[PDB]
Amino acid sequence: SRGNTYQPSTLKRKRTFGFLARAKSKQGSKILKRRKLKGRWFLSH
Amino acid sequence: TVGIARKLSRDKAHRDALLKNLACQLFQHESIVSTHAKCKEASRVAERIITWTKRAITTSNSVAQAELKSQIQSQLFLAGDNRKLMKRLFSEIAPRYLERPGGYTRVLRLEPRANDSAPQSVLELVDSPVMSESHTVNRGNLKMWLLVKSVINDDANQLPHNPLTLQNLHKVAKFKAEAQLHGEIMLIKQVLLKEMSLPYDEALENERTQALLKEVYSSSSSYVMVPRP
Amino acid sequence: ARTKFTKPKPKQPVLPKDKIRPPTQLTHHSNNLRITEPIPPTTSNLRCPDDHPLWQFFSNKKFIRSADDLPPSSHIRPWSIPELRHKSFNDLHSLWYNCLREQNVLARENHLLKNIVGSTHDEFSELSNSIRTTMWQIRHVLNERE
Amino acid sequence: SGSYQHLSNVGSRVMKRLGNRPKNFLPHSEKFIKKSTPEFMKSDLKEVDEKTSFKKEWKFIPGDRVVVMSGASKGNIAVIKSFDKRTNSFILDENG
Amino acid sequence: LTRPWKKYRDGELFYGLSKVGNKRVPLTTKQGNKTMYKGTRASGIGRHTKFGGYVIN
Amino acid sequence: AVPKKKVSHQKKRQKLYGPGKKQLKMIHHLNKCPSCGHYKRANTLCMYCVGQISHIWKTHTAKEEIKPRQEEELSELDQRVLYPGRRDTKYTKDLKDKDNYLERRVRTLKKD
RNA sequence: AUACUAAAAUUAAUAAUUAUAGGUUUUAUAUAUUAUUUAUAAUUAUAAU
RNA sequence: AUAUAUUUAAUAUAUUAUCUAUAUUAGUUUAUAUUUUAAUUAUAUAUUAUCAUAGUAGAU
RNA sequence: UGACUGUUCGUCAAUUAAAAUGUUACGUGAGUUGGGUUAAAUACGAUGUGAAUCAGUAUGGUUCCUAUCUGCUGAAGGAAA
RNA sequence: AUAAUUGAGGUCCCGCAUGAAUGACGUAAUGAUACAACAACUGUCUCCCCUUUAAGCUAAGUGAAAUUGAAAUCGUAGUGA
RNA sequence: UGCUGACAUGAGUAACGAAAAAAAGGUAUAAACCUUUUCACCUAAAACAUAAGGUUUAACUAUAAAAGUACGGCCCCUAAUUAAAUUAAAUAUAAAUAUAUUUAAGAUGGGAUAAUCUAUAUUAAUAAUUUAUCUUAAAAUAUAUAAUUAUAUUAUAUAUUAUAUAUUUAUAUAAUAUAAACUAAUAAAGAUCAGGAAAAUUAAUGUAUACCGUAAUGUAGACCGACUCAGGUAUGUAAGUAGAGAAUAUGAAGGUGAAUUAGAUAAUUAAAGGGAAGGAACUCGGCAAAGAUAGCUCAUAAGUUAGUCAAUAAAGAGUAAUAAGAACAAAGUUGUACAACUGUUUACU
RNA sequence: UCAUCUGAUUAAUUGUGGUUAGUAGUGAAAGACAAAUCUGGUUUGCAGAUAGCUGGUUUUCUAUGAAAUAUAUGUAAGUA
Ligand SMILES: [Mg+2]
Ligand SMILES: [Mg+2]
Ligand SMILES: [Mg+2]
Ligand SMILES: [Mg+2]
Ligand SMILES: [Mg+2]
Ligand SMILES: [Mg+2]
Ligand SMILES: [Mg+2]
Ligand SMILES: [Mg+2]
Ligand SMILES: [Mg+2]
Ligand SMILES: [Mg+2]
Ligand SMILES: [Mg+2]
Ligand SMILES: [Mg+2]
Ligand SMILES: [Mg+2]
Ligand SMILES: [Mg+2]
Ligand SMILES: [Mg+2]
Ligand SMILES: [Mg+2]
Ligand SMILES: [Mg+2]
Ligand SMILES: [Mg+2]
Ligand SMILES: [Mg+2]
Ligand SMILES: [Mg+2]
């Protein structure tokens, strides 16, 4: 039985999608800049 | 199995438990309110229990007595507030009905309950003593109280008593000493007066009661029946 | 599982009477103990000191400063910077501490007003703000002197 | 209430957004506000902002005497008892 | 019932007003694994030990 | 399984209010209560009178409110110190305002 | 008689006459022990489960 | 054991009512059981009830 | 009515007075089944250099529907008798 | 082998179009594999009956769905994209 | 089969999601909230502790309290791994970058001491893959005539008493004291699949003990499933009685009886129970449903690759049982085709 | 879901973290899985891709008013 694909764990989620993860890599930086340009309020977890 | 009793949307055991419980509660409290159907079945049980008790009290046969006792035990839950219920049945409850042949319980239709529309009823023991000492009144028989209230109302209005009311009174009397009945009525009446706004003159009230009793106690078409020509 | 067969083995020889030891403790209970109603602690047992330093969080001994018993903003004025400028360091320090103390008393009261009654009058808040202004002025003056 | 909001300032951005409502949608919020206040609290005059409100820069001062025109009591005389800063308005003794 | 004034089945939640919301929000001390230590600008006071203790300076 | 067409206003009306079965009847069966001349359903105890009786019974057969022995002579100040009254949650508050969600039996008219 | 309805029976309580369900009584049935018994009188007599 | 009346010379006897079949300690860590010790802390007593597919089976 | 076969058919067995031939979307899957039969897996024979293919063979293997109207089976209410 | 066998097992060999690591051939064990036979047991069936519970039905409370050109939406024969 | 909004139709229809409730009183306000009693349901759980998770849901704003020892984090130490980080010229490459090498980060692991309660700081000197604990031996208890037979005991885990040495506090000794389970620590040792990495001692001088987690929910109405969704979700304790067991029955204690009730129980459906005479005549096909004459101890052929493989063989016996009489484990024999076998596969035909 | 059935000391099951994927990884191999399903995901962009195909293209009144033949066409649903 599918449907329950997101299996929350705070550690994994901060480590993968978190602000610090984004800011550490060049690709991540691009993403953050993109979100800033769009004016998103929340740049990442 | 089919058509011997109500089913009440419960499987056997549960139904049995319910009915026994209801009987026990009735014995405890003298009067209870529930759904009509439940009441109707509960009465059947309760009446049977009462009769068994009576038989136990009466019959000389030791064997029979024992058997009846056993049956009574089976038909109850003697645990919490029903722990002394066995004693109560023999000592207090059963004696009231020694002369009365069946009809120990009375079911009275109420209004269907608002939320569910389920038809409700009062189930109660018939001749329950209305006056406990060190207490004033008892949580007794509703019908009697209602009758008394009706009588009071009539008196207030200065109207004659309805024939139906009189009939009811007569019924109440049948298995009741006169003096005792009078006393009971008096006890009820004062309380009722207190509850209501109406005033209370003792002697007058007593006189009225006496009058009511007297009529009750000492008893007193277009179609012509004719033989075949 | 238990079945038609079932030979239940006995417990033990329970060491023959003579072999046992005497129990280390003999007399145990008081086989006569009553369950009495509890005995709630009373404040009469205390002697709450009058000059207790925690009274310093209230104006006088009073839960709330009444609207009448507050200093009205017509009378009260915050300290000026220039005026402060000619004040000793020690004195300034003292003033600051006094201000802080006042704020604390206001602060508690303000909290009470907000959280419980849920009032929006904010006189206390205003007072606190005024005090804060004075404090900041003092700070500025201190910096400036240096 | 029962909040602890007073002790903190959180959701600062959100507060700013809700505090600095664009002025062309000010009618909206104000209407709602009007709807949700009793008759004795509410006043017909429009509020002025912290920048728009003046501080003197008033043409009058509480205490002095004043004539009121163009109202129901036009041509009235009254002592101006106090001012309401937010609204840039005066409250007049017993009259007006 | 959960709450007796709501008898009938409405669009009401067991608690609160909406299950969903912005999850991308600064996390506090209360959330996370056992190992997640946030801290509150309270202790740059002493020094941690080799063994787990804390020696104040 | 499924309607072939939108059911016309007429047709639905006649299905609903057309037949007798689906209509509410008038409760003809109702009469005076012997104790107080108010309306009541036939073959049924008056709901007011019975209620009154029940109330009286309750008053008489009231159980003794078992008040603790200590708290009766417990100083007001002391009480305050001990048991300070907290703020109740929203849910609790809601529960408390029973009048909002709970119904008291209505009284009938007087029969003539 | 019956999904709900409809059908059919009763709603007697006074000068008479009419039992609808529950109960109550009756005999009967069902169970499974019972004459080594129960009931009445004084281990004995009579009636019988 | 307690409560309530009785007799006795508060105490004891007996009557009525209510409540009670516990609990603590030993036997080398733990848990359970047994037996001892403590305590008023019980019946190879009559009768029930619940659950086990209506617990299962024989009749009905 | 049976044995055989997915079989309708057909070959037998036992009967029967007889075991007639059709039409009804070769009646009837919003009535049932899904054995045959046109999917995905796999194998065998054959064809193709090969992917793969077959008027082949074999094992496995997926649709669901609370009934608005007609209609029909019952049961009522209204009605002009 | 069955009363009766297009199924099963054995054997015969015009192998339409077997065959040796695309392995050939017989065997023990194993297999929720796929065919078949016997025993036992049964509502699978002859042939259905009864009983229980949850639904269905009625009363109260809440309250969907696909669908929908508009409908004042009968039968038959004929007609006709 | 336009798009958005509004409003219809089906329709006051289906459904309201695993189900045990009753009374009295709160409250002449209650099927649904609370309390009491009765009854039931879960109980190697629907309980009690917890991990993760999350709109704080909690017994709440007057709120979840730690120097640490059968308390966790941080901290020290590393694993797997990660790191526009680090060597005229580390090496390579259209750019982005990639690479080995150092340095740092990185728990799911390791980390002194301690109720006869314990001190981590500063300075100076020079471990464990799995698995078993048998046999023997020793001594003990009874029969029989030192030696034989039969039986249990045998490495550790305290308390009490009596002794000898330092002086009631210490040391060592002797004697006394149940069962079957479990735990930890000890020693010894069998298998092949050969079983982590990383941070010294003494002396002197010291110590005022930081920060954060802590509610409740957690086989669920409080997580992941669009829903207060019969699904998914990690760990420990899991009263007795019984039994080989965490099987199965009960259930002491605790918890729970629910966002639908009340009646009625037509046809009909689901999930059960029973069924005379037949016994596969059903059907594609015994599908489905029946069907167990010990679960302990004996006894068990052909065939065979020699493995009680076949085998839990079928049949059969011992103990129990003479027709009335729990639940759960346990459902036959044989032939053929295909594939040696245990495994893996199309999450959803 | 219920019943029934299979493995149940191992090529076992499982927690916590990590690595490998979009010409592309993982795969006891089923084109199976790579966030409700892939003979190759998703998102943003190229982008108003292209469509000899389907559908759609909104007031009125007046006058005139056809064709479905021939030829050619990778042409026969088109176009000259
Ligand atoms: Mg999702
Ligand atoms: Mg990565
Ligand atoms: Mg959620
Ligand atoms: Mg947490
Ligand atoms: Mg008669
Ligand atoms: Mg149970
Ligand atoms: Mg059809
Ligand atoms: Mg059709
Ligand atoms: Mg299969
Ligand atoms: Mg081969
Ligand atoms: Mg296998
Ligand atoms: Mg309804
Ligand atoms: Mg349109
Ligand atoms: Mg319908
Ligand atoms: Mg219906
Ligand atoms: Mg329904
Ligand atoms: Mg429910
Ligand atoms: Mg109530
Ligand atoms: Mg147990
Ligand atoms: Mg818990």
Ligand SMILES: [Mg+2]
């Ligand atoms: Mg490190």
Ligand SMILES: [Mg+2]
């Ligand atoms: Mg759920």
Ligand SMILES: [Mg+2]
């Ligand atoms: Mg056939």
Ligand SMILES: [Mg+2]
């Ligand atoms: Mg056949």
Ligand SMILES: [Mg+2]
């Ligand atoms: Mg089995």
Ligand SMILES: [Mg+2]
């Ligand atoms: Mg195989």
Ligand SMILES: [Mg+2]
């Ligand atoms: Mg993993």
Ligand SMILES: [Mg+2]
């Ligand atoms: Mg393929």
Ligand SMILES: [Mg+2]
């Ligand atoms: Mg695979």
Ligand SMILES: [Mg+2]
């Ligand atoms: Mg023309």
Ligand SMILES: [Mg+2]
């Ligand atoms: Mg074309």
Ligand SMILES: [Zn+2]
């Ligand atoms: Zn009345």
